[PDB]
Structure formats: structure tokens, C-alpha cells
Design a binder for these strands. Structure first.
Lengths: 82, 190, 208, 84, 150, 129
RNA sequence: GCUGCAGUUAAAAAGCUCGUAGUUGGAUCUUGUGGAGGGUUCCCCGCCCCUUGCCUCUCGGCGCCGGCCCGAAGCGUUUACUUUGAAAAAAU
């Protein structure tokens, strides 16, 4: 957040979950980052740079996260036509 | 005639006169005259597309529009070859009115019918361009720039009648209204 | 799948899926399990798609790879069928098994001597191991498990469908899970027969 | 609901098995039929939910029996729709 | 929902989007008119008329093969009735109730239901009579009910 | 009945956004709802929206994001005279800095920030933030 | 408690329905382009049919070379609403 100078304030800028577009607080212990491993996709062997996600507790606790994690990987890979 | 068959539209004009002459000639010819019955136009116009091609427009008096819809395909086929290298479509001309609720002055002349309104005419124009599909659905989408794109779901029969006219029909509507339209064939037919 | 046919399901594995009856799935359904099913028979039994099983296997396994420590991907199962299977899993691949009764408070205490902080979980059957799932949402653990048609989804991030009512469906699936993580991380890769088989991930089955 | 489902484009009959005024466009669930029965040799056209006795000009004088729904035919034959 | 019962319900007719002919059909506008005029002679009222066309003849409805409704066609002739059938059917019912009520004075249920159907006449009358479809002096009474239904 | 159409509309998109959705169905489509959502789209609280057409009155479908917190209606429709304005916007907005009271004027439907630059009062409809 | 209350159990929805006054009431009847003021389309003249809707004219000015053109005169079916003026004793 900006000021007169454009100087940035706020002690931490919180992170905003992928499929809910809302922000998770300092205490919120049902919110998970989930690391998918990429592969080279020529031999199907692990190669470094991961795809990382974040999900909030609200969609987790109702049981909607399973669709969100699927759709996120469906707009990328690995998922073709499921 | 061949020059005074375009009233309220200005009788002299080269291209429009050259249409009328050979048009009425076909109707007078004995080759087809058992479904052609000496109708006349009221104007005509030629308008392009971004496909790099021209297409001709035929206006009618509009009570006579109904009779054109009878033959409409045989006639258009013959004139597709006779005037070749351009696409051919019929359309109708209305005397659209400003509102008395105010876009031009009223004098308590008459009510203003709601078939003589603006919006009903722009709906009726679309009905003629793709008349052989007999429009199944209409949908619209609105853009973030405040533009609008008008989807039209057509019948899944009579496809190839309109499939080589599919883009060139869209360019017609642009010139008459000022709007952008797209034509689609749907997932499923009921 | 992703890569064109060097990750996609082979003709071989299809026989194993059908011989272990994984395709079959129970009578009762959930509204989160509707898409995974294709259809019903003429009888009460609903046939899980095997293509849809296969895609979920991969990113599940790829997440088990994505951690840089294989000693803190804590697997859990408490059903008798899922005891022998998990024991070989976490013996072969570096992982931590928690076999039998969970003994609650082991993801939230500072006094218990079985206290652990893992990152992932891999659970068999939500409705036998509901306890670790509830405690996972107090300390931010990603979660994976094996769902059936009638098993509800809640405090799980990804499912791996299976028949799993106590069958060869169980041990086969845990074997396949351990096979994939080695194709990406390990040197077992070649994708032509591995020495270890699914004939010892199957149930103890009281002998003569 | 999975709480993310599409509503723009529905399935052909897995989201058009719904009530007819709860669909995106309202459709009838009725149809016509071009009938030619073999006791009144004429090409008759009849609505599916007859609501009334349809008469015959031949030897017969009845073609339908109205019920609470679709009217059953006495001995009739030849079902068309056609198209709608 | 319902205006003198507590109920709620759907059974409404639903028309297609289309509205061509559609193609398959006959009896030009003019043919449909003479087909109608015969029916009104026989005492078939506008609701019945459209049914007897729709069930056994090639029409979908008589509003897409004509530019007018069924009633306006009859009205242009001058052969329309002097009160709508809707009003008539209300009054037609309530006379038999009053007969049964005179024959049996212990049917309080019938007496109750009469209050509803009675009040429903007066409400309907106050639509037409403000719109200059009835004389502004006409009223509903026992006497006027007897004569107007006959 | 359905006395006020716009008032029944906003509660759906309010309820839907809370549960976590991104497509809705709102009926029966008034022109008033269209120009409302147009202004609400420019600022960026919702995405592009599709108007289905029926002869009855139409139906509208919307694509939305979590940026919206709540849009409410204010009924019945009171007048504002550009000195009453400051009193309204204090009660109805979380902050001076952002939030947008909507209204209609003879110069068309718009936010309050625009109306102040045209010197036009008018009738207030709803709000959002 | 209009802004701003409450009525399952704490004080509290007429036993139930009909019904006039009162209050409240669905959808639907116009958009793009050069100049000017502000961006990179969009918000005082005009253009597609409309553009402050018309005429009819005649009396008293402005024109141009008897003849011709355009301001003022009736008004756009009626109101609410909103915006600008006028007119508002002092003291407080």
C-alpha cells in the first residue's frame, strides 16, 4: 500500500489463494501450499522447477479443494482430457 | 421499367440502374415467369467485407417482401450466376421513427406503433439475412470496453445453405446497424 | 497425459487393474464422486473410469517427489488390509509409517514422544482414519488419500479413486504408487519390469 | 453441487432432463404426429396430448382415448414428429 | 400462489422460442378464419375453439397463421358475446351452489365456498367495468345472476 | 409478486460469492440491472457477463471474482442534492478512500464520484464496495 | 429504535378466513463517425432516418446580387425529481 511518496507500508503483504481469491490471516492453520513437481516431459524424469499453489481453509473444510486442485492442473499440466 | 422502379431512393444511379434492367428482364423472360410476377425493388446498394469481396443488397417495398420469401433460393441461385463474383441477399426497408418521449418533436400525431419502433426493426432485419435457418437461439455477451457481440444459434439443418454466406452476412448487418454479430451452429438441436 | 506416451497408461497395467477389480465401486455415491464414475451397470455397482484414476495417480505421486526430504511423508493406515501394504511402501521408499491405532495428539503436542511434523499425508480410507485428517487442519499439512464412491471428501486436497473395501485393490494401488515416485526420482526408470511385484503388498490372509 | 459448475452450455439430456420452465430456453415436451390408420385411410395429423376424441371418417370413428397425459391410440400407427 | 386456497403449483404451458409456420402446414390465413366461424355457431367458445384446432388440425396455434388472436377475429365480425366466458363460468357455478344451499341449510361448507366465488366475481367485474368493457352501472345480485346466465 | 426486481437480484450474487462460485443465474433481467452491472464492471469487481435472450424477459449469467465483498440495495429511492451526499456516503461505505454509491440522474446511471463533476443530484439505487 | 430495536422459550403474532379504504406492484419503446474541450475509442454543430420538433407567415432589422436566406411569434401529451436564477427584517 502506497503513501505520498509511494512508500510501501504494511508489515507483511499477505498471500492470496488461487481458487477463492481471498487472503489468509496470521492465524489460519487449515491453509496449505501444495507443491507439484514438474518433469522434463521427454523421459518423464523430475526436473527442478516446481508448480506451487495455495488453498484456503474454507474451500478445504467444505470439500471443494479437490475440484480446485484438479482445475488448476487442468489449465496447465499434468492433465489432458480427464 | 428500369429507372422509376427505385422511388424514394433516387432514380438515377449507374450501378442501381444496371441491376434493375436485367432484373426485371429475367421476370419478363419466358424462361421463368411461373413464379416471377413483375415485382419491383425500391433501391439497391453494394457493400464490401473484410474478406476482400463485394456483396449486393436488394431492398423491397415491404408488403411485397412476403412474395420474395416464396422463391428466394432458385431466384437467388440464378442471380448468383447472372451477376457473378458477388454474394446476393434480400432485405427489407422500414421508415424508422424517433421517439415522442423525446428524440424529435411530437405534435400528438399518432401513438407510434411498437413495430415501427427502432429495436423491433433491428430484430426483424436479422430474421431475413439468415431466413432459411429460422433462428433457433439468440445470446449476447458484453465486453469490458462496453462493446457487445451478438451470438446467434442457428438450426443444425440447412447448414451448407448459409455456410459459404456465413461471414458475408455479418458484414451486411455492420453497415445497416453499427453493431458486431457472430454466427454459430450450436452443440445440439431441439 | 503430459508427455505424449512416456507417462501414459500402458496395455499391461490395464490387466492388473481389472484382475484386482479396481474398476468396480460401491452402490452409494457422493456429489464429489459423480465425475469420477462413468455409469452404473444393470445392477447396483458403479463403474469407476480407469483413465480418470490414472491422471490422479500422477500429480499425487509427483507431489510425493516434490519434497526434498524423504523421511517426512508420513503414511497412515489402520485397517488390517492396509497394514502390510503401507509397511512395504515406507520401507522401500523413504517415508514414515504409522500402522494401527493413531493415538491422537501426535501432530499437536510438545510432551508426547511420538510427536512429528511431516508435510504430506497419504491415508487409506477417510472413514477409518478420520482422526489424523482433523489434526492435519491444525498444522497446515497437505493431504492425499484413497477415496471410494461412498467415502466423502473433507480435509483432503486430492483423491486417488479405488474400490478399496478390502481386496487386492488395496495392495496393487500402493505398489503402483511406489513405482511412479521411483520413475521420476530413482534410477529404477526404464519403465520395463521392476523386480518387486504386487504379491506381497496384498493382505496377510490367515493361512492354513 | 460441486460449486464451480458451468451453466452457459448444458448437456444434451443430463441437464435437459429438468422441468421445462427451469431450462435456459423454454421448450414444450410435446410433439405432433402424422398418422395414417388402417380404418381411415387419410393422412391425419394429431397432437400427442389429444385432450379430446379425434374422429375418423372411415369405418372407424375413434382414433384416440384421452388420459391424464399422452393419449393412447385405439389401434393406430405411424408416428412422425416431424422435427418438433 | 392460489388466490383463495393456500396452495402453490406449476402446470403452465410453455411455448417454443421459434414461431415460423413451421413450414409443414396449410390453410392460408383466410382458410383458418372460415374454419373458426363455423365452430362459434355451434356454441364453441374461444377457449374450446383453439383446442379443437390444435388437437386434430395442422395448426400449432392461431396466432402464427394469423396476425390476430382467436377472439379479435370473432369480434371484428360482431359475433362476439356481450360478456367474457370467464365471468360467465363464475356466475354459472354459483347458481347451482345457491340451489343446493336452499335444498340443504346444514351444508356450511358450501356456504363458506360461496363467499369465495362470490367475492371473486366482484373483483373480476371491477377489472372490466373500469376498462369500459361493461356498463358503469352494472352490479351483481341474485336477480341479475339468474337472468344473465340464462 | 416480485415488487422490486433489482433488490432480489443482488442478494443472489452476494450469497453466491460467499460460498465460492464464479457463475450464477439471475432473472428476470431488467435493463436497470444491466447498466448497474456495467458501472460495477469498469471499476473491476466482476468480469464479462452474458445476456441470454428469451421473449419472456431474458436471463443473465455473470462471471465474477472474489474482489467483491458485498453489493446491497437501498430501497425506497431517496433524493440527494449534493449536500445530503456526504451524510449518505459516510454511513454506507467502509471508508472515504474506496467504495462507490451508485445513483441515477438525468445524465444517466453512474457512480457518485462522476455525478459530483457534472453537478447532478438524483435518486439513489444501491451501493457496493 | 426514520437513521436504528424486538415478538419459539425472557414482556409479545388477532382461533381462522374473506374484504373496502390505506400502502405496495413484472418485463418491453435508439447506436456509431470529422471540428471543438479531456484520454487513446469515450463525455458544443452537425451527419445515415433524427438532432434543440415545425411552420407561416407578417409586421418593425441583418445580410448578398426585383429576387433570395436566417434570429424573434405559437410549442413539442402532462407531473414528480434534479440543476440555475429571482425574491427573501434586524439582532442571534
Amino acid at each position: 500500500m502506497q503513501s505520498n511518496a509511494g512508500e510501501f507500508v504494511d508489515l507483511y503483504v499477505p498471500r492470496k489463494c488461487s481458487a477463492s481469491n481471498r487472503i489468509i490471516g496470521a492465524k489460519d492453520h487449515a491453509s496449505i501450499p501444495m507443491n507439484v513437481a514438474e518433469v522434463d516431459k521427454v523421459t518423464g524424469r523430475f526436473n527442478g522447477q516446481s508448480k506451487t499453489y495455495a488453498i484456503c481453509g474454507a474451500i478445504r473444510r467444505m470439500g471443494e479443494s479437490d475440484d480446485s486442485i484438479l482445475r488448476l492442473a487442468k489449465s496447465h499440466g499434468i492433465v489432458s482430457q480427464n | 421499367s428500369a429507372k422509376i422502379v427505385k422511388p424514394n431512393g433516387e432514380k438515377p444511379d449507374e450501378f442501381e440502374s444496371g441491376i434493375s434492367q436485367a432484373l426485371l428482364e429475367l421476370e419478363m423472360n419466358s424462361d421463368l415467369k411461373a413464379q416471377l410476377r413483375e415485382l419491383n425493388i425500391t433501391a439497391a446498394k453494394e457493400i464490401e467485407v473484410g474478406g476482400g469481396r463485394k456483396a449486393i443488397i436488394i431492398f423491397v417495398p415491404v408488403p411485397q417482401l412476403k412474395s420474395f420469401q416464396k422463391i428466394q433460393v432458385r431466384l437467388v441461385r440464378e442471380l448468383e450466376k447472372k451477376f457473378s463474383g458477388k454474394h446476393v441477399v434480400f432485405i427489407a426497408q422500414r421508415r424508422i421513427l424517433p421517439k415522442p418521449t423525446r428524440k424529435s418533436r411530437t405534435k400528438n400525431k399518432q401513438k407510434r406503433p411498437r413495430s415501427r419502433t427502432l429495436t423491433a426493426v433491428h430484430d426483424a432485419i436479422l430474421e431475413d439475412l439468415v431466413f432459411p435457418s429460422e433462428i433457433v437461439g439468440k445470446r449476447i455477451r458484453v465486453k469490458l470496453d462496453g462493446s457487445r457481440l451478438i451470438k446467434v444459434h442457428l438450426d443444425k439443418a440447412q447448414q451448407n445453405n448459409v455456410e459459404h454466406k456465413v461471414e458475408t452476412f455479418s458484414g451486411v448487418y455492420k453497415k445497416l446497424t453499427g453493431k458486431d454479430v457472430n454466427f454459430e451452429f450450436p452443440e445440439f438441436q431441439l | 497425459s503430459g508427455a505424449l506416451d512416456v507417462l501414459q497408461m500402458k496395455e499391461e497395467d490395464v490387466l492388473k487393474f481389472l484382475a484386482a477389480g479396481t474398476h468396480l465401486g460401491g452402490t452409494n455415491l457422493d456429489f464429489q464422486m459423480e465425475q469420477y464414475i462413468y455409469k452404473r451397470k444393470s445392477d447396483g455397482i458403479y463403474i469407476i473410469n480407469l483413465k480418470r484414476t490414472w491422471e490422479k495417480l500422477l500429480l499425487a505421486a509427483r507431489a510425493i517427489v516434490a519434497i526434498e526430504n524423504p523421511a517426512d511423508v508420513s503414511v497412515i493406515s489402520s485397517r488390517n488390509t492396509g497394514q502390510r501394504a503401507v509397511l512395504k511402501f515406507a520401507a522401500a521408499t523413504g517415508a514414515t509409517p504409522i500402522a494401527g491405532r493413531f493415538t491422537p495428539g501426535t501432530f499437536t503436542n510438545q510432551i508426547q514422544a511420538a510427536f512429528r511434523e511431516p508435510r504430506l499425508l497419504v491415508v487409506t480410507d477417510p472413514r477409518a482414519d478420520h482422526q489424523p485428517l482433523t489434526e492435519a487442519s491444525y498444522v497446515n499439512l497437505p493431504t492425499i488419500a484413497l477415496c471410494n464412491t461412498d467415502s466423502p471428501l473433507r480435509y483432503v486436497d486430492i483423491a486417488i479413486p479405488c474400490n478399496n473395501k478390502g481386496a487386492h485393490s488395496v495392495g496393487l494401488m500402493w505398489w503402483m504408487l511406489a513405482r511412479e515416485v521411483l520413475r521420476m526420482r530413482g534410477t529404477i526408470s526404464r519403465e520395463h519390469p521392476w523386480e518387486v511385484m504386487p504379491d506381497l503388498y496384498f493382505y496377510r490372509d490367515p493361512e492354513e | 453441487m460441486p460449486l464451480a459448475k458451468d451453466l452457459l452450455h448444458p448437456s444434451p439430456e443430463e441437464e435437459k432432463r429438468k422441468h421445462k420452465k427451469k431450462r435456459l430456453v423454454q421448450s414444450p415436451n410435446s410433439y405432433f404426429m402424422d398418422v395414417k390408420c388402417p380404418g381411415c385411410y387419410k393422412i391425419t395429423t394429431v397432437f400427442s396430448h389429444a385432450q379430446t376424441v379425434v374422429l375418423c371418417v372411415g369405418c372407424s370413428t375413434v382414433l384416440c382415448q384421452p388420459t391424464g397425459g399422452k393419449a393412447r391410440l385405439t389401434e393406430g400407427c405411424s408416428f412422425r414428429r416431424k422435427q418438433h | 400462489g392460489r388466490m383463495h386456497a393456500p396452495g402453490k403449483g406449476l402446470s403452465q404451458s410453455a411455448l417454443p422460442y421459434r414461431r415460423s409456420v413451421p413450414t409443414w402446414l396449410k390453410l392460408t390465413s383466410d382458410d383458418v378464419k372460415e374454419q373458426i366461424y363455423k365452430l362459434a355457431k355451434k356454441g364453441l367458445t374461444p377457449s374450446q375453439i383453439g383446442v379443437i384446432l390444435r388437437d386434430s388440425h395442422g395448426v400449432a396455434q392461431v396466432r402464427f397463421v394469423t396476425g390476430n388472436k382467436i377472439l379479435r377475429i370473432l369480434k371484428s365480425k360482431g359475433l362476439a358475446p356481450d360478456l367474457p366466458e370467464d365471468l360467465y363460468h363464475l356466475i354459472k357455478k354459483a347458481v347451482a351452489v345457491r340451489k343446493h344451499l336452499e335444498r340443504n341449510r346444514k351444508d356450511k361448507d358450501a356456504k363458506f365456498r360461496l363467499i369465495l366465488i362470490e367475492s371473486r366475481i366482484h373483483r373480476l367485474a371491477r377489472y372490466y367495468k373500469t376498462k369500459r368493457v361493461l356498463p358503469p352501472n352494472w352490479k351483481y345480485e341474485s336477480s341479475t345472476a339468474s337472468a344473465l346466465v340464462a | 409478486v416480485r415488487m422490486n426486481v433489482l433488490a432480489d437480484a443482488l442478494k443472489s450474487i452476494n450469497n453466491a460469492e460467499k460460498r465460492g462460485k464464479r457463475q450464477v443465474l439471475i432473472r428476470p433481467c431488467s435493463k436497470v440491472i444491466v447498466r448497474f452491472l456495467t458501472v460495477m464492471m469498469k471499476h473491476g469487481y466482476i468480469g464479462e457477463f452474458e445476456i441470454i435472450d428469451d421473449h419472456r424477459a431474458g436471463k443473465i449469467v455473470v462471471n465474477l471474482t472474489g474482489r467483491l465483498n458485498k453489493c446491497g440495495v437501498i430501497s425506497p429511492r431517496f433524493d440527494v442534492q449534493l449536500k445530503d451526499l456526504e451524510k449518505w456516503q459516510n454511513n454506507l461505505l467502509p471508508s472515504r478512500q474506496f467504495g462507490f454509491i451508485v445513483l441515477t440522474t438525468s445524465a444517466g446511471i453512474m457512480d457518485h464520484e462522476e455525478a459530483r463533476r457534472k453537478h447532478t443530484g438524483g435518486k439513489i439505487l444501491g451501493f457496493f464496495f
